[PDB]
Amino acid sequence: ARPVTSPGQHLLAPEDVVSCCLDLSVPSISFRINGCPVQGVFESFNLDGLFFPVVSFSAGIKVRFLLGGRHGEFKFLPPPGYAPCHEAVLPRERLHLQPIKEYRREGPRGPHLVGPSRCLSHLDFVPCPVDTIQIVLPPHLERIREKLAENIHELWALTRIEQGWTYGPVRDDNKRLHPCLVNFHSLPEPERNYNLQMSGETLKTLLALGCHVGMADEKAEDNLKKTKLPKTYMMSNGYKPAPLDLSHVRLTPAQTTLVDRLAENGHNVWARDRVAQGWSYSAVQDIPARRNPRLVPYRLLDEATKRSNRDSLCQAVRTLLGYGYNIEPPDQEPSQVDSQSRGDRARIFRAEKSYAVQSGRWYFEFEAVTTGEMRVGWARPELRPDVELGADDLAYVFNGHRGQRWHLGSEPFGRPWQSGDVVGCMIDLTENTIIFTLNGEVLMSDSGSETAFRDIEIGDGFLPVCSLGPGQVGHLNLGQDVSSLRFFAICGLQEGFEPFAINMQRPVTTWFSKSLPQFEPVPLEHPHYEVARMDGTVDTPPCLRLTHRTWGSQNSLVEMLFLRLSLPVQFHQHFRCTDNRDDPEIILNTTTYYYSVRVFAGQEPSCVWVGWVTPDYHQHDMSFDLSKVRAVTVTMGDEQGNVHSSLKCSNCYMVWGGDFVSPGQQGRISHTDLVIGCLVDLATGLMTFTANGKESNTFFQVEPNTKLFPAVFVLPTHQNVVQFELGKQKNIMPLSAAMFLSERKNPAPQCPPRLEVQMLMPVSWSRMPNHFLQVDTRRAGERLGWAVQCQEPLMMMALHIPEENR
Amino acid sequence: GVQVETISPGDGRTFPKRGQTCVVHYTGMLEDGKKFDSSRDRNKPFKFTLGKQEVIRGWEEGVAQMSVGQRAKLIISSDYAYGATGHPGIIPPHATLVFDVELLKLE
Amino acid sequence: VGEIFIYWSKSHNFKREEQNFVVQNEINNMSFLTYSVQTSLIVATLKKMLPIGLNMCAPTDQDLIVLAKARYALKDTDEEVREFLQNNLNLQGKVEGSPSLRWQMALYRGVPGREEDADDPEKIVRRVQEVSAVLYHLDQTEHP
Amino acid sequence: ELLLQTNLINYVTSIRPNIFVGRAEGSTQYGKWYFEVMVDEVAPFLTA
Numbered sequence A: 001a002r003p004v005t006s007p008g009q010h011l012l013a014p015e016d017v018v019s020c021c022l023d024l025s026v027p028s029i030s031f032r033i034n035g036c037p038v039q040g041v042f043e044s045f046n047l048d049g050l051f052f053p054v055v056s057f058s059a060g061i062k063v064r065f066l067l068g069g070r071h072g073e074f075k076f077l078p079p080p081g082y083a084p085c086h087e088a089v090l091p092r093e094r095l096h097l098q099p100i101k102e103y104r105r106e107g108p109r110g111p112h113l114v115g116p117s118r119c120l121s122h123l124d125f126v127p128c129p130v131d132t133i134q135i136v137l138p139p140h141l142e143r144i145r146e147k148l149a150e151n152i153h154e155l156w157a158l159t160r161i162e163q164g165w166t167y168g169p170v171r172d173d174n175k176r177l178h179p180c181l182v183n184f185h186s187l188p189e190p191e192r193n194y195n196l197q198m199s200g201e202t203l204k205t206l207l208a209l210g211c212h213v214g215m216a217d218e219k220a221e222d223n224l225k226k227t228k229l230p231k232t233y234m235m236s237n238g239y240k241p242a243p244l245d246l247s248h249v250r251l252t253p254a255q256t257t258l259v260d261r262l263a264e265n266g267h268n269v270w271a272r273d274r275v276a277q278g279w280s281y282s283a284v285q286d287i288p289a290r291r292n293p294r295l296v297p298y299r300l301l302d303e304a305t306k307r308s309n310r311d312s313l314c315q316a317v318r319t320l321l322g323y324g325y326n327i328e329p330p331d332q333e334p335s336q337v338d339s340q341s342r343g344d345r346a347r348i349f350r351a352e353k354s355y356a357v358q359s360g361r362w363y364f365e366f367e368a369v370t371t372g373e374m375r376v377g378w379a380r381p382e383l384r385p386d387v388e389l390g391a392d393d394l395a396y397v398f399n400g401h402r403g404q405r406w407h408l409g410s411e412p413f414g415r416p417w418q419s420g421d422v423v424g425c426m427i428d429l430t431e432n433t434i435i436f437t438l439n440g441e442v443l444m445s446d447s448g449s450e451t452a453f454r455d456i457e458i459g460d461g462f463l464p465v466c467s468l469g470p471g472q473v474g475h476l477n478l479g480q481d482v483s484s485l486r487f488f489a490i491c492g493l494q495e496g497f498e499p500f501a502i503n504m505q506r507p508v509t510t511w512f513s514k515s516l517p518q519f520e521p522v523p524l525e526h527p528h529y530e531v532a533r534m535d536g537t538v539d540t541p542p543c544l545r546l547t548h549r550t551w552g553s554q555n556s557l558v559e560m561l562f563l564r565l566s567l568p569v570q571f572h573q574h575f576r577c578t579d580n581r582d583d584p585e586i587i588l589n590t591t592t593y594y595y596s597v598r599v600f601a602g603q604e605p606s607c608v609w610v611g612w613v614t615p616d617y618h619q620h621d622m623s624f625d626l627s628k629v630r631a632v633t634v635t636m637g638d639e640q641g642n643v644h645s646s647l648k649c650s651n652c653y654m655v656w657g658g659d660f661v662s663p664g665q666q667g668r669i670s671h672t673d674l675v676i677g678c679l680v681d682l683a684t685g686l687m688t689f690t691a692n693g694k695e696s697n698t699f700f701q702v703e704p705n706t707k708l709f710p711a712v713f714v715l716p717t718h719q720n721v722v723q724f725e726l727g728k729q730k731n732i733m734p735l736s737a738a739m740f741l742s743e744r745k746n747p748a749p750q751c752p753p754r755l756e757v758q759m760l761m762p763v764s765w766s767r768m769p770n771h772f773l774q775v776d777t778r779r780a781g782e783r784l785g786w787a788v789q790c791q792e793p794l795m796m797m798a799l800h801i802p803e804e805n806r
Numbered sequence B: 001g002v003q004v005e006t007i008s009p010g011d012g013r014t015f016p017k018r019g020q021t022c023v024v025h026y027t028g029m030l031e032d033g034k035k036f037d038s039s040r041d042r043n044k045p046f047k048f049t050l051g052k053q054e055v056i057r058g059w060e061e062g063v064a065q066m067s068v069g070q071r072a073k074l075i076i077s078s079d080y081a082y083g084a085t086g087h088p089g090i091i092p093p094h095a096t097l098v099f100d101v102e103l104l105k106l107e
Numbered sequence C: 001v002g003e004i005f006i007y008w009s010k011s012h013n014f015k016r017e018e019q020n021f022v023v024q025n026e027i028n029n030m031s032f033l034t035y036s037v038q039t040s041l042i043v044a045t046l047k048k049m050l051p052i053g054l055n056m057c058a059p060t061d062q063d064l065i066v067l068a069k070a071r072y073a074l075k076d077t078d079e080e081v082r083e084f085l086q087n088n089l090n091l092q093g094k095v096e097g098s099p100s101l102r103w104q105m106a107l108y109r110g111v112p113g114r115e116e117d118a119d120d121p122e123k124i125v126r127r128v129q130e131v132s133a134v135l136y137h138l139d140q141t142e143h144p
Numbered sequence D: 001e002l003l004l005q006t007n008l009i010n011y012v013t014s015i016r017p018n019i020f021v022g023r024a025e026g027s028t029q030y031g032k033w034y035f036e037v038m039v040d041e042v043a044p045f046l047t048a
């Protein structure tokens, strides 16, 4: 938190109007309190995502979003050029207030568990049509090239007049005057050329997508009938549209899919052209300002517009098919989405370990509000959070999207559910079996067995577990309120199964697989990574060396690896104002500390980043590079500018081994280690680096009290990757001297047991709070905006790990 | 030391006078940002009389610089605080203290 | 169906003819459900209908079913079991005895129609007798 | 700095309108946006 000057400063109080301005060009975020400027700005921040307005709060507030238009009348005028945020609602969306990345919700008969939310990307607004320039029309297609040029325009005018659009001198949608309803050949030159180009472009795109076309009729092709449009369809100027008339054709499903693809391509081409001309999207049309409600990539477009475009393209395809051209749909190219990591994607909710049952007959229910990828069943207490349910031997579950039973793999079982279906999961530890019922009816395997799993080893016990994929919603009923169960009496009650939480005074606690990456000690049994604690010899300092166990073999795992050291170095509270043997006075008065990383020969320096991270680093980026690092400049000045301070804030301070690899050595594998040294002055906030003794040009400046963890990000390219060398340099203290108080004056390098290598893990178990804030979001009015209210307090006892600032 | 930074305004007229009893709520943090004391956790306002040297110098001056109903932040240096000795077990030696004080009333 | 199952369990010729019929005619028992006494429709049909019967018995009766099972293990007749239950009615398990019986009773009384059941002693002894006999013979069969 | 520290804290939650804006080469989205928040009620200390 950085104090920011503003007239009449005061912590936000009733009747305060905060005004937030986002300028993505600079980029910059600026504020205005009650119309007065706030002398401070965020800027130069990462732009790899979508920005949204947000308000965070604890209980005891009432606030209202004013988004302009009919969604809250601004109390102050937006600064010149800024658009009201109500214009950014997508065509297929309705403006309303939301929670963010919720894993839990309320519902008619209890809480709903929610899987990950599928969100858009900033790149989803960049229309990407397929290249159609090199596609020169083969002779017959060139012959028909301009033939559609008239026909499509004729159909367009006819459709307009059928919906009531009657020619006029100018553009006036009220009286319905329109200038372009004139003979195509005499249509205004720009529009006529555009229509000619698109009439050819439909064929060009047909070829580009891979469609196969060839002439099939000549005399029947020539045979043409037009539409005798009456005076109602005749224009004010008298022009009569003359579109081609043919209804003797049918459409294949592949042809309909191709029509959809053609519509997508055409709309994306139009959107790209308008973006190049300088147009943008807006919920409210504004022609003078080059804002258009349809200027969005086809996929995000509204259903009605999709249907209209598809109708036009379908008519074109019908014309071609009637002419006989054998338009064989292109060979479909198989592909997947793989938008995310499947193992880490689905959110897993399990009962707490203390609830594990090692005997008896237990039953619980799982209603599937959606119909997607949801799994439900019984898991062992040592269930991992980063592995799919039932992919290992730690869970026996049922996936009712396609009707499979999962344990150490998949197998067909049961039938897929539908929205609202209740799966009753039963475990019998007297017979060591698991049963699944759907809407009260037992699910049978293909063979015909009633039990889903058999010969179940009890082990440590079993716990209710479910896994929801992105966009999925479930309802877990453990049976505390026996009357709430919907299909218990039908199946399970007489069989003698007892609701899992029948005699529990309080609701069962649950834990969910939080997908926030966290640094954890490298497992001592990790299949692929080994860390060796090498002792300090006479001519070598203490070291922690990483080696890839399974390098150069099948099953090897090669991917980005983010490592840090368990303990941080903390900069002093207040910064200073403004042979090869250490000199005792200098070494005992110095505040500079050093540590090196040795990248072993074979490990490409271009695949290693060395430096420091703060406690806030939470990126498991599989395609990491120094451009992905979070950064933001906070700049504060006076009323008339006069910048007073400009602080850069980040969570990763590193250098790239590619900066040090030399061009002569580039392109070939080197045979020498690369030693990158990192120096930090805990009394001045300055961080510098050296490579093979030579100094580097990179340097960072941090603020007092900052905590920095030694860190290394590497993509293993050799069985020996890197080595944290916790040594020293002439007149420079080792890391242990800064890390440990007892060693504050000891210049002998050390690697105590606490200092260890930790790696970033993408998923971890996290307890679900038993009570949640009751936030009321509604629409106060067309001028009052959208009201958020939270009046009931809610607290928790937090346990703080001092070194991790967590 | 003591620096006073307003958080919420007060009436701006009724200021403490010597011999009066200031009733406040406060939350004491070390300069690092670690909470070490808070009357709001005990849920009882802290009353202290000005001029009797009951509280440390930083309080004696900062609270005097405040107005009834005002919420302020007092940044107090070691000399205007427990100083070199500190508060054994609570406040380290030579520690700057940050307080979020609220002058509830005068009596 | 329970009476027919009891006849099947008692008489051994009936089982022999069942096994014959199924083997010779090559009837697909699994197909009917959707060679093996497990697939024998005589016992499978019972197992299917058994919850219908057990729904009659109030969970309080569970003790009386247990005792009737002991009688049938001692090889008594139906009248013997009926009189044994008649004079051992007071052994009725009390709901306060076990928390499980608490919620079982909650469900049983909450469901309409069962509020008037578990009232008349002759009805109680009957139901416990039939269900206990069926359960005993089912146990005998499932024992390999 | 050594013993785990405990303290009572307030739960905090965030609310947004479903409005998403970004920047990318060739994107169809405008670049400048503005909104406001009016504070009706605030209890400075509803808890400790």
Ligand SMILES: Nc1ncnc2c1ncn2[C@@H]1O[C@H](COP(=O)(O)OP(=O)(O)OP(=O)(O)O)[C@@H](O)[C@H]1O
Residues within 6 Å of the ligand: A153, A156, A180, A191, A194, A195, A198, A266, A267, A270, A294, A305, A309
């Ligand atoms: N929203 C859209 N989606 C897809 N294609 C479009 C869209 N808007 C325009 N086009 C393309 O541009 C053509 C515009 O129609 P036409 O050129 O006959 O009339 P215009 O009067 O010039 O256009 P407009 O009615 O948009 O002012 C459409 O036939 C289609 O080829």
